[PDB]
Paper text:
Dihydroorotate dehydrogenase (DHODH) is a key enzyme in the pyrimidine biosynthesis pathway, essential for DNA and RNA syntheses in all organisms. Human DHODH (HsDHODH) belongs to class 2 DHODHs, which occur in the mitochondrial membrane and operate through a ping-pong reaction mechanism involving two distinct steps. In the first step, dihydroorotate (DHO) is oxidized to orotate (ORO) while flavin mononucleotide (FMN) is reduced. In HsDHODH, the second substrate is ubiquinone, which is reduced to ubiquinol.
The HsDHODH–lapachol complex was solved at 1.31 Å, comprising 365 residues (Thr32 to Arg396), 1 FMN molecule, 1 ORO molecule, 1 acetic acid molecule, 3 glycerol molecules, 3 sulfate ions, 1 lapachol molecule, and 245 water molecules treated as oxygens. The overall structure reveals the characteristic α-β barrel fold typical of HsDHODH structures. This study discloses the first crystal structure of HsDHODH in complex with a quinone, providing strong evidence that this site is indeed the binding region for the second substrate, ubiquinone. Notably, a slight conformational change in the side chain of Arg136 observed in the crystal structure, with a root-mean-square deviation for all atoms (RMSDall) of 1.26 Å, enabled interactions with both the carbonyl group at carbon 1 and the hydroxyl group at carbon 2 of the naphthoquinone core. A minor variation in the side chain of Gln47 (RMSDall = 0.78 Å) also facilitated a hydrogen bond with the quinonoid core of lapachol in the crystal structure, a feature not predicted in the docking model. According to Baumgartner’s classification, lapachol interacts with subsites 1 (Met43, Leu46, Ala55), 2 (Arg136, Gln47), 3 (Tyr356), and 4 (Val134). Notably, the interaction with Val134 is unique to lapachol.
Author numbering: 32 to 396
The structure:
Amino acid sequence: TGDERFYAEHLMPTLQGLLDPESAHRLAVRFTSLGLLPRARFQDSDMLEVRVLGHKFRNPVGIAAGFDKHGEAVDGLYKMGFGFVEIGSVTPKPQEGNPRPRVFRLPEDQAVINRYGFNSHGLSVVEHRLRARQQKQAKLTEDGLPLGVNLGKNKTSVDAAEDYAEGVRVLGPLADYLVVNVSSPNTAGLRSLQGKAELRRLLTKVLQERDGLRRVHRPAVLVKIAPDLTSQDKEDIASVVKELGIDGLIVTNTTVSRPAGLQGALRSETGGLSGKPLRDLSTQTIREMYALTQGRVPIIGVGGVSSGQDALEKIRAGASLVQLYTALTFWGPPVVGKVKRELEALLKEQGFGGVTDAIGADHRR
Ligand SMILES: Cc1cc2nc3c(=O)[nH]c(=O)nc-3n(C[C@H](O)[C@H](O)[C@H](O)COP(=O)(O)O)c2cc1C
Ligand SMILES: CC(C)=CCC1=C(O)C(=O)c2ccccc2C1=O
Ligand SMILES: O=C(O)c1cc(=O)[nH]c(=O)[nH]1
């Protein structure tokens, strides 16, 4: 389409030439929040509907955590055509995150490196922001546009499990699903919570807190994992998720690896790498986690999605839903309708009745 070409070829590269990435992010959130974007033209086909995690998703393309960290732009993100929105990560207390600069573009790689370090307005501010639109969200969710909330932990926390428990208590009642984010590369010791013993203790506490919420306020609980896990780590996570009845996995966060071939001048910056160089590392992690959970644990697939093909590869590997972030930063809002249009076309070409028929299809070949 003309908008896709205009944004991708002219407007976004021009604005990126003018603005440092964190300034660009802040202006993107402000513009989205104000609805200063035409309403998406693409009308969602019945082929794109997914029923998973106790909810209807009008389309399987979500905005990944970290774009709307503080729940400021939720309605603008639905207006952009996302089938679901995930906010956060949110930490219990407000915290500033790492010193600036902490976000870096790798244009030659269609990648970003970030070390934000969980900059967060904190649970109380986000709670009041979501409460201001709680019944609007109830109607959106009923109409197939669910809301996820991603929970983090404060830098100076002495008890990680209590940070996540506080998040469940405060934002669980406002969420369709919660994400226990134990895979940020930018908080010291956080990824150690993916270990078997630490994860079983942490997730038992999180599920007990969730189960204590009133039924209409009781969200699904997902664990978001790194792309950098050992085979042992992945087997341990699969075992714990099945043992405790965790509702789903988000696969994956950013990578601390630096794949051979990166060209960006900023490739050796500390932080998590996102975008195209992460794509197939994430797809293969989805594939492994689907097999280790016997296809019984819903997966939200994320990492380097910028086309219908990228989305369908993750769905065929075992994802019920996908998310994107970094593609939005390069191609702008038109990328959402592009992914959905291309995904519909490919499902038809490959003989799938809809997204649901394609979930895990590669494992049945
Ligand atoms: C600038 C930036 C900030 C992010 N912040 C968060 C976060 O707060 N919580 C989280 O779970 N993931 C966060 N992520 C990771 C994304 O949710 C996603 O897992 C990852 O970027 C891969 O998707 P992509 O290649 O489509 O960007 C962030 C990613 C980026 C690029
Ligand atoms: C061109 C404008 C105004 C916004 C696009 C954008 C980036 O360029 C960026 O680097 C970026 C980096 C991290 C998060 C979000 C973004 C983003 O939203
Ligand atoms: O630094 C952050 O806040 C952040 C970055 C990232 O890539 N992933 C995440 O979970 N948090």
